[PDB]
Amino acid sequence: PFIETVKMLDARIQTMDNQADRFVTKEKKDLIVDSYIKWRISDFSRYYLATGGGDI
């Protein structure tokens, strides 16, 4: 009764990227890189309290 809070721990969002990051070759040459990361929640139990809060 008293208070209803269940924040749904979504299992849908898999979109994360790095806007612009720098790296280095062996040949002492600069080369900017960009990539995107895709990831799915797998086992929920450890995942929660593996972060304490579901805040992405």
Place this chain on the structure above:
Amino acid sequence: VEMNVQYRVTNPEKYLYSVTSPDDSLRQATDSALRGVIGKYTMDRILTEGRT
């Protein structure tokens, strides 16, 4: 040369009832560590391979 650090607390009671004023100790030892690393290497090498 300049850098930046990211830090995280695990055991709160050591964060409280130990050396006081945390950011003071953190920053004011990081400077010494940065001197320790930067010292031994030559000017050109610091110019070129600063990131690895």
